[PDB]
């Protein structure tokens, strides 16, 4: 449960203050809130995406793959709990279920393939219910799945749908670094050398947002993803 040094907390205060917690929060602050809500019977909090989101913040800040996956697996459990308690209409619950599930499996091919249907279902639910959440996060997840899943007809993989969704994320939510990064990856992988200028400009814009914006402890893992695309394009 909450550690002994945590501030006094109530469900009402956590709900009212839920947006004061984020990627810039220190780990101790995030865990005080996460450990509290696991034990809370407050109907709203029990249905909320907050616990799953906190787990994703903790996953993203951990460079070790096993440690990151451990927190991501906790986020999957928190989102599943929220859905069982009545959060099914909340697009953010499905979003953080799919985002955490992705982190938990994407470094392991067997697990990624084994969870592709669940990822697809949850990413689609997020896109249906709250496509704009987290600056278009659900479009990011579903678009990347269209880019990375086994290619049609073997699976849902479809580069045109990837480009449609990730282009829509960039158009509708230009402030997020990963909308530009992921769109750039799709442009390169689906269209190749003919989109090099656009790929590069999208990378550069994402990097500028990454460097200037306030992404807290998400910055290091996103920087690694930017480097990955740089190396992929040569």
Numbering used by the authors: 27 to 260
What does the paper say about this structure?
The aerobic methanotroph Methylococcus capsulatus was the first bacterium shown to synthesize sterols, producing a mixture of C-4 methylated sterols that are distinct from those observed in eukaryotes. C-4 methylated sterols are synthesized in the cytosol and localized to the outer membrane, suggesting that a bacterial sterol transport machinery exists. In this study, we present three putative bacterial sterol transport proteins in M. capsulatus that exhibit remarkable specificity for C-4 methylated sterols. We first used bioinformatics to identify a cytoplasmic membrane protein (BstA), periplasmic protein (BstB), and outer membrane associated protein (BstC).
